[PDB]
């Protein structure tokens, strides 16, 4: 049947605009007699209404800034871009659609924490762990630019079975009974917080020296637990991938070993590193079990790596099989074996869209064009991509009513990509012929033709001043 | 076991009171006691801090735990000035064992400063008390100094007594923590006791030898147990090695005569601590003892594939065959199921020994729990019979409930073994006493197994009403053991239709007490007879619209709760397998076929007389309905006929023999108004029915043009319970 524009008896361009964004008004004086003023544009054109005299230029959106996205993360001579900017024009209750894409150009953030065994058995392995630490910092910088690296040390619990306490001298020099010198023993001490100053890391790593204890197994798992749960002391970044490198040449103590030393309290799995950077609960809490370590590692999203000597590679390979996701490498003069594991972790390292400053009366809808050009309706995120991958999204926008403000803007915001999809919005809710009382369209004048009603003066009433109060009898 | 009200013991706060527990049965008197070790307790010894105590707790009616004064002297002084010895923070009472009138209490962390140099070596020491004597036994305090020798042996970390009173010590620290097993007779220890020499040796001591460096850090002797596995009347030594087999763990069995190795049993997962605890006892009823190994840190894969730490216990039956026969796994994470094991003896006296197992972090609030696993032919049950949990409120520090256990001994002599559970995290030990077990079965029968709906040959007492009453009976017989008095007391409840849930009509009654239910107190001679009683019941005629289903005769019985406790102060318990709940179905027959399952079918039709009705004033109307039935009779039939909003029902036509004598009570709860008429008394197969319903029409205006009806009819029984919908219409003329 006939459309809404005509069936509603629209009387003015204002009402025609208000009825629906699809309706159009013909302002041409040449319109044929009887033809409706408010109608679909094609019907007005069929009635020979001049195209420029029709009050409906179609809504449109177009670019505002469209710099192409970058292709390399080095930023040789300018800041990289990964998102571009558009402007929008709307009629009342109007809607439009568009699309955009984003790309992962910059290098992923990575954190490496290095745990050094400083037992006396490591004296002849000391260069290897110093060498390995140096090449971890150096080789990682050739994979990602924003690395963060730190390190810490462990020996074992400083208590009677493991610690030398026999002569008073032994406390200050654990190597007394050998008539040589070494450092006092410690449970676990945090030395260097995660930082990008690789040169500082190298200097601090090369000035470490071994302590001494009694029994072959060491308290390394106490250090792994504390490095995992003391995030603010260690400085793990919430967005970076976390790698923990663990070094030793002997087997390791596990839960229920502390019973020999009189320690029965289970490992709490909480931070106990103070201002002196030493594990303060070393002598009062038992070693952690494999189950507890796996819980905290997964909870904090840390990938543990073992860099151990040949004689204990099988022992830690079995441990790794019980801690999902961890790997084992051989510690030796040639450190290439463990470096490959860091390369592997980086080789297996995600976007979502937020909206900010949206208008009070404007709405949106989203759809995703994920990898392999697959299209998912309603989604605003895409996972699984790597560096260099590009993904796209499509957006539909709509307004209800029309604000009195001529222009306003909002933006969309991907997570962590530093870029903003600022969109400008303009409203064209007016008629050209409405720019400029006593209209002849009313009954013999006596009225103002605005808003579709004459608003008659004294002595007249009605839509077009067609009645007078003395003739407009109540009956 | 009695869980509602166990006996609890409390030691000094912070003492670890309850780290080790055992029963004490001296020969000097019939008195019974419990030994509780408190390794952190302060003592009277001069100049010793937290030396540890062992506290004696009598089973008398009014008593408190009292420390045993094994040693009052302080640390010995070497020649000149400095102390020879360090008794401070020795864990005296970490292990406590007893053998009739002998007690063995050990201090694993005792250190001494040797001669020839200033050292500090945790050799560990044990004190052996007899009826009169108290002697010291420190076999690792020897001339072989340092970790390369026996300096860090920690002898007494684990201990046990052989049936012939040999002392067994395990020291996990000897020879760079290879571990060692050491044992002497009580006679040998006393014969060679010279307190004035620290390095005294016992001339016929049995000890395991030092091995290669490959075996270091194995912790042989972390736990020990004794049992016969060579088969010549001399108990053998079972020792845990939780870090051997490259950390897989293993358990050795040594010949009790020469310490030579007999068998090895290896853990299946690294770091499981296979061997944390061990026990030996026959569980499948043979002459041969079996082996139990705890692996508290065992991890098994969850549904999502990740490993979950629950703990596990391995069972090895013996005639010993290397591979374990059955396993028990914990059901909660980080529970450490299998931390303690204790033979319970024949807890339920059914003919097979039972085991108790602990998880110091299982249960709600992770306080710790003990699981009772009943033995039987072909080993332990796959599920526990009972769960014990600390009834005190959880607190900041764990109670470690179930860390230490001991059973297989009777305290109050009621005939059933009892159990001791220690919770050293709260400095408490708790006593569980086994209650007498009563095994019973019942009977339930009806003489007229099938009830006739219309026989009504049975009259009420002194009343003209006659009903189809029937005869029923029930029985109950019991057996017991121990000091269980033979005059058992039971209560049995009878119910006729208790399964009529949601307030459904009660439909049957007992003749006496005229009630649907009746509770009877019963007394039975234990194993003396099988007793039966009879009862009369009747259906209440038949005011229930439930003849579609049989009567759900039901009964249940329980031990008489308010009966007095026995002489020992406990109330018996029903065996778990007994069928405390029993029921049978009583079928109802009017004429419902030879197979007793009749198969009805229904036919129906409808018509109207004044099919043309006027508007503007009240006009009469009548609806005619007929029904035909198929099958072995019909009952509970009802006219589910819907009526319009513009007319009212004014009764059925009762005054014509050509129409059936229906009874009606129309309902108007919703716009789907119904006439609701009953078809009357039951009818036989092939019966035909015709009826006519009167109505008054109150159409107000000509907006309507017709009125419509919809009807349904119920079936005789469950088959085709309700018929499909049928419709009829009446027109409006003007
Ligand atoms: N009764 C036995 N079974 N004895 C055999 C035990 C052999 C077992 N190992 C040794 O003797 C060897 C001698 C030759 C092999 C080089 N490792 N020496 C060591 O093991 C020392 C020092 C060292 C390490 C590496 C290279 C050179 C020297 N290492 C340690 O870790 C310290 C404690 C520490 O600082 O962590 N002690 C132990 O670990 C246990 N102590 C030992 O003696």
Swiss-Prot record, chain A:
Residues 265-285 are annotated as: CX3CL1-binding. The keyword Signal applies. Ca(2+) 1 binds at residues 121, 124-125, 249, 333. Residues 175-182 are annotated as: Involved in CX3CL1-, NRG1-, FGF1- and IGF1-binding. Ca(2+) 2 binds at residues 156, 213, 215, 217-218, 249. Phosphorylated on tyrosine residues in response to thrombin-induced platelet aggregation. Probably involved in outside-in signaling. Residues 4-50 form the PSI domain. Isoform beta-3A and isoform beta-3C are widely expressed. Isoform beta-3A is specifically expressed in osteoblast cells; isoform beta-3C is specifically expressed in prostate and testis. Glycans are attached at residues 97, 318, 367, 446. Coiled coil: none annotated. Residues 433-466 form the I-EGF domain. Disulfide bonds join 5-23, 13-431, 16-38, 26-49, 175-182, 230-271, 370-382, 402-429, 433-451, 442-454, 456-465. Residues 107-349 form the VWFA domain. Belongs to the integrin beta chain family. It is linked to Glanzmann thrombasthenia 2: A form of Glanzmann thrombasthenia, a disorder characterized by failure of platelet aggregation, absent or diminished clot retraction, and mucocutaneous bleeding of mild-to-moderate severity. Glanzmann thrombasthenia has been classified into clinical types I and II. In type I, platelets show absence of glycoprotein IIb-IIIa complexes at their surface and lack fibrinogen and clot retraction capability. Bleeding disorder, platelet-type, 24: An autosomal dominant disorder of platelet production characterized by congenital macrothrombocytopenia and platelet anisocytosis. Affected individuals may have no or only mildly increased bleeding tendency. This is Integrin beta-3. The lineage of its organism: Eukaryota, Metazoa, Chordata, Craniata, Vertebrata.
Curated annotation (Swiss-Prot), chain B:
The keyword Signal applies. Glycans are attached at residues 42, 258, 264, 455, 521, 581, 670. Keywords: Calcium, Cell adhesion, Cell junction, Cell membrane, Cleavage on pair of basic residues, Disulfide bond, Glycoprotein, Host cell receptor for virus entry, Host-virus interaction, Integrin, Membrane, Metal-binding, Receptor, Repeat, Signal, Transmembrane, Transmembrane helix. GO terms for biological process: angiogenesis; apolipoprotein A-I-mediated signaling pathway; apoptotic cell clearance; calcium ion transmembrane transport; cell adhesion; cell adhesion mediated by integrin; cell migration; cell-cell adhesion. It is found in: Cell membrane; Cell junction, Focal adhesion. Its main location: membrane. Ca(2+) 2 binds at residues 282, 284, 286, 288, 290. It is a single-pass type I membrane protein. It comes from the Eukaryota. FG-GAP repeats lie at residues 1-66, 77-138, 141-193, 205-259, 260-324, 325-382, 386-449. GO terms for cellular component: alphav-beta3 integrin-HMGB1 complex; alphav-beta3 integrin-IGF-1-IGF1R complex; alphav-beta3 integrin-PKCalpha complex; cell surface; cytosol; external side of plasma membrane; extracellular exosome; filopodium membrane. One of its GO terms (molecular function) is integrin binding. Heterodimer of an alpha and a beta subunit. The alpha subunit is composed of a heavy and a light chain linked by a disulfide bond. Alpha-V (ITGAV) associates with either beta-1 (ITGB1), beta-3 (ITGB3), beta-5 (ITGB5), beta-6 (ITGB6) or beta-8 (ITGB8). Interacts with CIB1. Interacts with RAB25. Integrins ITGAV:ITGB3 and ITGAV:ITGB5 interact with FBLN5 (via N-terminus). ITGAV:ITGB3 and ITGAV:ITGB5 interact with CCN3. ITGAV:ITGB3 interacts with ADGRA2. ITGAV:ITGB3 interacts with FGF2; it is likely that FGF2 can simultaneously bind ITGAV:ITGB3 and FGF receptors. ITGAV:ITGB3 interacts with IL1B. (Microbial infection) Integrin ITGAV:ITGB3 interacts with herpes virus 8/HHV-8 envelope glycoprotein B. The alpha-V (ITGAV) integrins are receptors for vitronectin, cytotactin, fibronectin, fibrinogen, laminin, matrix metalloproteinase-2, osteopontin, osteomodulin, prothrombin, thrombospondin and vWF. They recognize the sequence R-G-D in a wide array of ligands. ITGAV:ITGB3 binds to fractalkine (CX3CL1) and may act as its coreceptor in CX3CR1-dependent fractalkine signaling. ITGAV:ITGB3 binds to NRG1 (via EGF domain) and this binding is essential for NRG1-ERBB signaling. ITGAV:ITGB3 binds to FGF1 and this binding is essential for FGF1 signaling. (Microbial infection) Integrin ITGAV:ITGB5 acts as a receptor for Adenovirus type C. Belongs to the integrin alpha chain family. The constitutive activation of ITGAV:ITGB3 on neoplastic cells may contribute to tumor growth and metastatic potential. This is Integrin alpha-V. The lineage of its organism: Eukaryota, Metazoa, Chordata, Craniata, Vertebrata.
């Amino acid at each position: 049947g006939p459309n809404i524009c005509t069936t509603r008896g629209v009387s003015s361009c204002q009402q025609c605009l208000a009825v629906s964004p699809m309706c159009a008004w013909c302002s041409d004086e040449a319109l044929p007699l009887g033809s409706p003023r408010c109608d679909l544009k094609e019907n007005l054109l069929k009635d020979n209404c001049a195209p420029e005299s029709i009050e409906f230029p179609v809504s449109e959106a177009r670019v505002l800034e469209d710099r192409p996205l970058s292709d390399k993360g080095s930023g040789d001579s300018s800041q990289v871009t990964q998102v571009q900017r558009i402007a929008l024009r709307l009629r009342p209750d109007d809607s439009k659609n568009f699309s955009i894409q984003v790309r992962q150009v910059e290098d992923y953030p990575v954190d490496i924490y290095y745990l050094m065994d400083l037992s006396y058995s490591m004296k002849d392995d000391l260069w290897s762990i110093q060498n390995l630490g140096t090449k971890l910092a150096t080789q990682m910088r050739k994979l990602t630019s924003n690395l963060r690296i730190g390190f810490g040390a462990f020996v074992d619990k400083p208590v009677s079975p493991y610690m030398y306490i026999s002569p008073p001298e032994a406390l200050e020099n654990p190597c007394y009974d050998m008539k040589t010198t070494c450092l006092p023993m410690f449970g676990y001490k945090h030395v260097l917080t995660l930082t990008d100053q690789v040169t500082r890391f190298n200097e601090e790593v090369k000035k470490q020296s071994v302590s001494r204890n009694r029994d072959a197994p060491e308290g390394g798992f106490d250090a792994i637990m504390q490095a995992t749960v003391c995030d603010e002391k260690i400085g793990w970044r919430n967005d970076a991938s976390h790698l923990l490198v663990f070094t030793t040449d002997a087997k390791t103590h596990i839960a229920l070993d502390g019973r020999l030393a009189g320690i029965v309290q289970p490992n709490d799995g909480q931070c106990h590193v103070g201002s002196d950077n030493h594990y303060s609960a070393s002598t009062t809490m038992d070693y952690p079990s494999l189950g507890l370590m796996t819980e905290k590692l997964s909870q904090k999203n840390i990938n543990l790596i073992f860099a151990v000597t040949e004689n204990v590679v099988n022992l830690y390979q079995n441990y790794s099989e019980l801690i999902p996701g961890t790997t084992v490498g051989v510690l030796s003069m040639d450190s290439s074996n463990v470096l490959q594991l860091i390369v592997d972790a980086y080789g297996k390292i995600k976007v979502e869209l937020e909206v900010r400053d949206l208008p009070e009366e404007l709405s949106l809808s989203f759809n995703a064009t994920c990898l392999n050009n697959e299209v998912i309706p309603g989604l605003k995120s895409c996972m699984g991509l790597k560096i260099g991958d590009t993904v796209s999204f499509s957006i539909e926008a709509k307004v209800r009513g029309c604000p009195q403000e001529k222009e306003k803007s909002f933006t969309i915001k991907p997570v962590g990509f530093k870029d903003s999809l600022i969109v400008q919005v303009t409203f064209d809710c007016d008629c050209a012929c409405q720019a400029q009382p006593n209209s002849h369209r009313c009954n013999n004048g006596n009225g103002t033709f605005e808003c579709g009603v004459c608003r008659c003066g004294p002595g007249w009433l009605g839509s077009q001043c067609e009645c007078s109060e003395e003739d407009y009898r109540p009956s | 076991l009695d869980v509602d009200s166990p006996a609890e013991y409390s030691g000094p706060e912070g003492s670890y009171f309850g780290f080790a527990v055992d029963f004490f049965v001296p020969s000097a008197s019939s008195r019974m006691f419990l030994l509780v070790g408190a390794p952190k307790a302060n003592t009277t010894q001069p100049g010793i801090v937290e030396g540890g105590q062992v506290l004696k707790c009598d089973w008398s009616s009014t008593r408190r735990c009292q420390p045993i004064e094994f040693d009052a002297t302080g640390n010995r002084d070497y020649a000149k000035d400095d102390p020879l010895e360090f008794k401070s923070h020795q864990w005296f009472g970490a292990s406590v064992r007893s053998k009739q009138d002998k007690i063995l209490a050990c201090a694993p962390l005792y250190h001494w400063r040797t001669e020839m140099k200033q050292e500090r070596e945790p050799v560990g020491t044990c004190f052996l008390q007899d009826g009169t004597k108290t002697v010291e036994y420190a076999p690792c305090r020897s001339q072989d100094i340092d970790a390369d020798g026996q300096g860090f042996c920690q002898g007494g970390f684990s201990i046990d007594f052989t049936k012939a009173d040999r002392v067994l010590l395990g020291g996990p620290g000897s020879f760079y923590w290879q571990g060692q097993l050491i044992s002497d007779q009580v006679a040998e220890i006393v014969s060679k006791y010279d307190p004035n020499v620290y390095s005294i040796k016992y001339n016929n001591q049995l000890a395991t030898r030092t091995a290669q460096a490959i075996f270091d850090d194995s912790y042989l002797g972390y736990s020990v147990a004794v049992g016969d596995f060579n088969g010549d009347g001399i108990d053998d030594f079972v020792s845990g090695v939780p870090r051997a087999a490259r950390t897989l763990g293993m358990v050795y069995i040594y010949d009790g005569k020469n310490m030579s190795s007999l068998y090895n049993f290896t853990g299946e997962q690294m770091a499981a601590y296979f061997g944390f605890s061990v026990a030996a006892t026959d569980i499948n009823g043979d002459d041969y003892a079996d082996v139990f190994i705890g692996a508290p840190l065992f991890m098994d894969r969850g549904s999502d594939g990740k490993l979950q730490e629950v703990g596990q216990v391995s069972v090895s039956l013996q005639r010993s065959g290397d591979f374990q026969t059955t396993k028990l796994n914990g059901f909660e994470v980080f529970a450490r199921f299998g931390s303690a094991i204790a033979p319970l003896g024949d807890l339920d006296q059914d003919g097979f020994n039972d085991i108790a197992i602990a998880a110091p972090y299982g249960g709600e609030d992770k306080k710790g729990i003990v699981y009772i696993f009943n033995g039987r032919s072909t080993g332990l049950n796959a599920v526990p019979s009972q769960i014990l949990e600390g009834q005190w409120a959880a607190r900041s520090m764990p109670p470690s409930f179930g860390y230490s256990m001991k059973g297989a001994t009777d305290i109050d002599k009621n005939g059933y073994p009892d159990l001791i559970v220690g919770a050293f995290g709260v400095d408490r030990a708790i006593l569980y006493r086994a209650r007498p077990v009563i095994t019973v079965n019942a009977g339930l029968e009806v003489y007229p197994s099938i009830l006739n709906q219309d026989n009504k040959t049975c009259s009420l007492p002194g009343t003209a009403l006659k009903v189809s009453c029937f005869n029923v009976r029930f029985c109950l017989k019991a057996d017991g053991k121990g000091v269980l008095p033979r005059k058992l007391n039971f209560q049995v409840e009878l119910l006729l239709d208790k399964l009529k849930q949601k307030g459904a009509i009660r439909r049957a009654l007992f003749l006496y007490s005229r009630s649907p239910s009746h509770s009877k107190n019963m007394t039975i001679s234990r194993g003396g007879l099988m007793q039966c009683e009879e009862l009369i019941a009747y259906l209440r005629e038949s005011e229930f619209r439930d003849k579609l289903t049989p009567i759900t005769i039901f009964m249940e019985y329980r031990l008489d709760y308010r009966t007095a406790a026995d002489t020992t102060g406990l109330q018996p318990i029903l065996n778990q397998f007994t069928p405390a709940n029993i029921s049978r179905q009583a079928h109802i027959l009017l004429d419902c076929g030879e197979d007793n399952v009749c198969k009805p079918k229904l036919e129906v039709s409808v018509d109207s007389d004044q099919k043309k009705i006027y508007i503007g004033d009240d006009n009469p109307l009548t609806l005619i309905v007929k029904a035909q039935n198929q099958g072995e009779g019909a009952y509970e039939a009802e006219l589910i006929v819907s009526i319009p909003l513009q007319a009212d029902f004014i009764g059925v036509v009762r005054n014509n023999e050509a129409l059936a004598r229906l009874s009606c009570a129309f309902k108007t709860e919703n716009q789907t108004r119904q006439v609701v008429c009953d078809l009357g008394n039951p009818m036989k197969a092939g019966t035909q029915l015709l009826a006519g319903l009167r109505f008054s029409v109150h159409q107000q205006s000509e907006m309507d043009t017709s009125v419509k009806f919809d009807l349904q009819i119920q079936s005789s029984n469950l088959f085709d319970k309700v018929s499909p919908v049928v419709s009829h219409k009446v027109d409006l003329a003007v």
